[PDB]
Amino acid sequence: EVQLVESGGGLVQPGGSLRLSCAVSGYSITSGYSWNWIRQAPGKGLEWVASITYDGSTNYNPSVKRITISRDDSKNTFYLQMNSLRAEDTAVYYCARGSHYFGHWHFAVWGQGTLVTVSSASTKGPSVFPLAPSGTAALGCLVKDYFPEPVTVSWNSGALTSGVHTFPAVLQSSGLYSLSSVVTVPSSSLGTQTYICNVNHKPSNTKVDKKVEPK
Amino acid sequence: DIQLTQSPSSLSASVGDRVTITCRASQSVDYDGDSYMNWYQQKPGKAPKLLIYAASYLESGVPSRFSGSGSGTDFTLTISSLQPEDFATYYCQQSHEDPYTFGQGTKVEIKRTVAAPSVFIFPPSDEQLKSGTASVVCLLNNFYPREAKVQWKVDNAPQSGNSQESVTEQDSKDSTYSLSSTLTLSKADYEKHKVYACEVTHQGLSSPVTKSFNRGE
């Protein structure tokens, strides 16, 4: 039904500005009581930062109150602006809808969340290497040397999801990230079924499709 | 300002058992005959999902095994029968005062039987060797509990300082974990040795398991 799609995330510079947008579909933005932005630092909890009500009234968290929230009924979208960005602002930002009954500030409809990385470093695309297999066989892809987070890995364009393990990325000493995604398949299918891992790195516009073949 | 204290920080319970989480507010959240406390469920990589609102009202579309109770400053979230998909971090949140703060979260883990890991070892790809660096990857697959040890051996010499590990979240399909270890060597050092082993120690193993391969075979 109602879908909240976020955009405007990614790599931003310290001291620069951030402009997020939450597009609402299958639902008129004038029907929600309020629209909110909620962020979550990596490994930390949730923090509400801003809201705007149907009557145009706005409110902000005093811990960040260099922040502006706005609403465009014509475009059916509301926005979040932040300047003087610091390292503490690196977080996954969500957009959420308020409530009409039993209080207004419990959120039942959330967006998918976009990651905002505050860093002066340069974006680097990843190198995708195959993990070739030797009952059940294992194979995977090695996504190496990219910045910043995140990287989305799928197998066979999303058709293969069972037995897939995409591990958390590790921060290498070089300052770059590196993760691996593996999958367990029947050994009798290595000759007939193909296996393509789809690596997508949005901050660098990198989309690599590597086929893992038995050596 | 209202502050929330969730308890416990984490717990481990067998599947089908009852789980109880508590939330304590620094001041009352009761108003007009309602307790403005809410509960959320957040699974790995997903957005938080509302479970209970106004202390005890079940959100539409949420399984009936979730329920809330309490009033004033003390509240309770209960899972009557823990299911494998209920592995998540659970948050309480007061909706009575700006800035509508969330609790610090409670991690709920499913405690299943012991499962030994399936070990796989991967040689570095010939495409990566063109860059001068070799990455040897060892995979520990579908094991419980989470604790596991990986020891790299290059030509029977134990390695140190040149590997990095990574463990997945608990997999609701299996209630198990998986571990990926990457040994990083230079191309020259990789081409100068024969046997690359991955020794795995785990509770589900009576003896340590060692997977290895010979370079050039």
Numbering used by the authors:
A (entry chain H): 1 to 65, 67 to 135, 142 to 222
B (entry chain L): 1 to 217
Paper text:
Immunoglobulin E (IgE) plays a central role in the allergic response, in which cross-linking of allergen by Fc∊RI-bound IgE triggers mast cell and basophil degranulation and the release of inflammatory mediators. Omalizumab is a clinically approved anti-IgE monoclonal antibody that binds to free IgE, also with high affinity, preventing its interaction with Fc∊RI. Instead, the Fab alone selectively crystallized in different crystal forms, but their structures revealed intermolecular Fab/Fab interactions that were clearly strong enough to disrupt the Fab/IgE-Fc complexes. Mutations were therefore designed to disrupt two recurring packing interactions observed in the omalizumab Fab crystal structures without interfering with the ability of the omalizumab Fab to recognize IgE-Fc; this led to the successful crystallization and subsequent structure determination of the Fab/IgE-Fc complex.
The Leu158Pro mutation alone was not sufficient to prevent selective crystallization of the Fab, and the structures reported here were the result of unsuccessful crystallization trials of the complex between FabXol1 and IgE-Fc. Two structures were solved for FabXol1, in new crystal forms, and the space groups and unit-cell parameters of these structures, FabXol11 and FabXol12, are provided in Table 2. Again, the β-strand inter­actions between Cγ1 and Cκ domains are disrupted, but new packing interactions involving Pro158 are formed. In molecules FabXol12A and FabXol12B, the heavy-chain CDRs adopt similar conformations to those in the FabXol, scFvXol and FabXol11 structures. Despite the different contacts formed by CDRH1 and CDRH3 in molecules FabXol12C and FabXol12D, the packing environment would not preclude the CDR conformations observed in the FabXol, scFvXol and FabXol11 structures, and in molecules FabXol12A and FabXol12B.
